[PDB]
Structure formats: C-alpha cells, structure tokens
From a paper:
Poxviruses are unique in requiring eleven transmembrane proteins that form the entry fusion complex (EFC). The fusion apparatus is embedded in the MV membrane and consists of eleven proteins namely A1610, A2111, A2812, F913, G314, G915, H216, J517, L118, L519, and O320, which comprise the entry fusion complex (EFC). F9, the subject of this study, is a 23.8 kDa protein with a putative transmembrane domain near the C-terminus. Here, we report the 2.10 Å structure of F9 and demonstrate a fold similar to L1 but without a hydrophobic cavity.
The VACV strain Western Reserve F9 ectodomain, consisting of residues 1–176 with an added N-terminal 6-histidine tag, was refolded from bacterially-produced inclusion bodies and purified to near homogeneity by immobilized metal affinity chromatography (IMAC) and size exclusion chromatography (SEC). F9 crystallized with four molecules in the asymmetric unit of the crystal used for data collection for refinement, resulting in the 2.10 Å structure. The F9 ectodomain exhibits a bundle of five α-helices (α) packed against two pairs of β-sheets (β). Between α3 and α4, a loop of 12 amino acids protrudes starting with Gly90 and ending with Ser101. As the transmembrane domain begins after the α5 helix, both ends of F9 are close to each other and to the viral membrane. The atomic structure revealed that Cys33 and Cys55, Cys47 and Cys127, and Cys107 and Cys149 form three pairs of disulfide bonds. Cys47 is located in β2 and together with Cys127 it forms a disulfide bond, which stabilizes the β-sheet pairs at the bottom of the molecule. In F9, α3 turns proximal whereas in L1 α3 is located sideward forming the entrance into the hydrophobic cavity. This cavity is missing in F9, although a hydrophobic area similar to L1 is found. With regard to the divergence of F9, its differing orientation of helix α3, its absence of a myristoylation site, and its lack of a hydrophobic cavity likely contribute to F9 functional differences from L1.
Author numbering: 2 to 166
The structure:
Amino acid sequence: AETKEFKTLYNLFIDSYLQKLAQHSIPTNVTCAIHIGEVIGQFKNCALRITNKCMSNSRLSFTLMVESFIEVISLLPEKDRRAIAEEIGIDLDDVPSAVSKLEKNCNAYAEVNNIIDIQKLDIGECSAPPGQHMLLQIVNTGSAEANCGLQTIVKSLNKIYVPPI
C-alpha cells in the first residue's frame, strides 16, 4: 500500500504556520524576490512539499513563524521547551513580535550571503523507516532571511518524533 506518514513536530509547526500565511496575504502574492532552487540534506524516505507563498516583509514572516513555534513547542515538557528554544534563538517570554536572536542571526547571514535570486535550503536529515515517509513542507516566502528562519526551525523540529494518532 501507500507509505504512512512519519510525523514530527515540524509537521505541527508548518501546518500552523501555513494557516497564518494564507490569512496574511493582502493581495495574493507580491513579486517573490527570491526562490528556492536547491535543497540539500540526507534523504532516505523523504517526502518534500515545496511551495511559494511570498509576502511583503520578513518581519511579518518571523512574527507568525514565532507564534507557531511557541504554539507548537508548548506540547513538550518544560526543560525540553527551553532547551530547543535556546538552540533556535527564540525567547519564550518575549512577545511573538519581538525580534528574536534567530531573526537577527538570519538577517545578519543575509547581509553577507550571495545576493542572487536563488536560495539553497538545508533540511538536515529527512529519514523515515521502511514503509513510511517523512513529509517536510518547505514554504518559500520570498525572503532570504525568512527562509533562513524556516531552515533553522526545520533542522531542529524535524528531529523530534510525534507518536502516531
């Protein structure tokens, strides 16, 4: 039959984040200044879903990006929440609109990185047991700094397994 989904926390995050992206479209899209043209990682039974859904500014991306992270991470024990939040660079006490260290780290990476309209994205490890698949929805928001934020979140939440239900 068809392979069953090997769900992780990133699935919960992206599903939350995609809902917010659809609402915060004022038009439908603007001119996507950047596109995802290159995905790297270690693939075993990987299911990638690449979509464009770009918007006006990265601050709005990171805001809903942070709302979803806080919303999803709360399903973890206390010490697990603060530990991963510190690795990504998000403060669980700040309001979801506060510029996290993640966003500043991403904004700073964009100031030196290679200009051009194509972005490479590293999804880390996309592996699932035989008979299963890891769905990994990657959304381009037309910003190099926002795509950097999603990448950091992928490479962390993707390692945390959600038992099936």
